[PDB]
Amino acid sequence: SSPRDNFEALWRIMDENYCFFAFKDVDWDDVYDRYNLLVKDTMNQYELFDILGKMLAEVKDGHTNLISSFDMSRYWAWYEDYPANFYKEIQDNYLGTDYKIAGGMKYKRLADDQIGYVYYGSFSSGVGENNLDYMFAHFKECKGLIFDVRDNGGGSMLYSDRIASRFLEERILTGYTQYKKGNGHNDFTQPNPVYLSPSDRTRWLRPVIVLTNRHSYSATNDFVNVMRLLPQVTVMGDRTGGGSGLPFSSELPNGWSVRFSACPVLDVNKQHTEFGIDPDTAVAITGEDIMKGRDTIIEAAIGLLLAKGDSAISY
């Protein structure tokens, strides 16, 4: 397995399957011409790995990686160029030690029991129908809900759909999917509509604040995409980390593998969500709030939900 064969195979895999060339400042043909002069069959496996990793970093994509048995290439400036906007130690001041555990959820009432707070760290940690019903019943008397998915790198779409379906009033269009039809960079199938139906179990139609950060991505990005379509939902924090939760993976002749997003996911306006979704209200954790043991994002969400409107029960 020669370096030039692995260079050729990797360039071709990207050329024919990478979905987002239209949104990148580089031309993949000029990337071929440049790296063609750099890859030599005298290179050892480490030199080849560094150069091919740099080649993938040309598309500046946090979702693209080259994986060998010794390293994984990454463009993590995609995540690291944004503030953390989440600290477990500051979150401990809100959850304490007496928070409740229902599957993959941590939950507790805040602000004199007026606000329900949920932290859902991973879509890989399952949530059952009873877990959700019990969490909602604990928050029966609450004015609103905080659903915090900051630092949630995704996981299973089964839990994504199961949680999101609890906030629906009726069946809705959630967005669209496209898939690579051919080798051409823009050779996609027509946008396919994806729908979600409301749950038959306990639903939450009261105000909701969804908390996001750059470390909210993949299945979490798709979850956020559905939640921001709902009238009772406000998304707060920072731009999500994007991605789709639907990866492409292929092996190289040398056994290394390349991965990236397999399909473009579009919102209801047929706009790409791959590069992340902006919150409704941008809020960043401040240096002085950390010093006070406060989470600026949780506090802004509490403030917004407590902001009193009319004293009327209506529709």
Ligand SMILES: [Cl-]
């Ligand atoms: Cl269940």
